[PDB]
């Protein structure tokens, strides 16, 4: 029952959660249990403007 197909909603709401979580990980993921993102590793040369 439940005319609105729920199974197709979950598999769609699982690849979506996976997609944005992967993008979030490769950026700021911290060491253990996450790919070390290039924003948190901080070995890119960094330039800062003066006030």
């Amino acid at each position: 029952e439940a005319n609105y197909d729920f199974l197709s909603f979950m598999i769609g709401a699982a690849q979506r959660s996976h997609r944005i979580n992967r993008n979030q990980a490769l950026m700021i993921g911290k060491g253990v249990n996450e790919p070390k993102g290039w924003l948190t590793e901080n070995c890119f040369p960094v330039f800062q403007t003066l006030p």
């Binding site: 029952e1 439940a2 005319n3 609105y4």
Partner: protein, 34 residues
């Protein structure tokens, strides 16, 4: 979300009488007083 399948039964449960009409003397008038 749960659409209930509508079946096509129709319970009546009421009760009529018999009829004494055919026994009575049938007759037909055309005016309103005879």
């Amino acid at each position: 979300f749960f659409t209930p399948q509508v079946l096509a039964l129709e319970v009546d449960c009421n009760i009529e009488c018999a009829s004494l009409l055919d026994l009575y003397g049938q007759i037909e008038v055309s005016r309103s007083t005879f």
